[PDB]
Structure 1
Amino acid sequence: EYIKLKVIGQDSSEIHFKVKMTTHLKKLKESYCQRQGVPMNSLRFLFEGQRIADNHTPKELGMEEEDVIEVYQEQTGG
């Protein structure tokens, strides 16, 4: 049904989402990016420390309410 999530970025950018536990987390992901002006890739979202699948959903994460998600700027070695 509905569980309010807390997507915390890596620059004090906090955003709250109400999502249906039947919806693919990608929808959440996407929203963030456009409501923030950043390509779907540019970032990366995590939960319980481990990364988040694009098809994921609390249906798999059992994320209760008040949960938290971390977003990290995407990067690579050099």
Structure 2
Amino acid sequence: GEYIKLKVIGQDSSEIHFKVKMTTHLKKLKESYAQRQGVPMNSLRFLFEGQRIADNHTPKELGMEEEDVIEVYQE
């Protein structure tokens, strides 16, 4: 399996990029992002093409590709 780099855009326009395996559940990206922002994971919602990313969504399931963008909003 392969890895892709995703760009996570914060409410303040800051970015953290993540190298994620196509089969990894995106809960792990959500946890990492929230840890690095210093906020509870459940205070955030993560969107891809405006649609909510579930904990058990994989990049393969969502059709994600290299350099695709994820947006973070307050829950």
Q: Report the TM range for the smaller structure's normalisation.
A: over 0.9
Tell me, yes or no, if structure 1 residue 62 matches structure 2 residue 63.
Answer: yes
- Give the CA deviation at 1:13: 1.7
TM-score if structure 1 supplies the norm length? 0.90
Higher strand share: 2
**1:67, 1:15 → 2: CA distance?**
12
Distance in 2 between residues matched to 1:41 and 1:13, nearest whole Å: 20
Match of 1:10 in 2: 11
Identity of aligned residues (%): 99
Aligned length: 74
Instruction: Give 5+ residue unaligned stretches, structure 2.
Output: none
SS at match of 1:41: helix
Q: Determine the C-alpha separation between the residues in 1 that align with 2:50 and 2:35.
A: 24
Question: TM-score, normalization: structure 2?
Answer: 0.93
Pick the structure with more helix per residue.
2
> Computing the radius of gyration over CA atoms, which structure comes out larger, 1 or 2?
1
TM-superposed CA distance for 1:59, in Å, is 2.1
The answer for unaligned runs of 5 or more in structure 1 is none
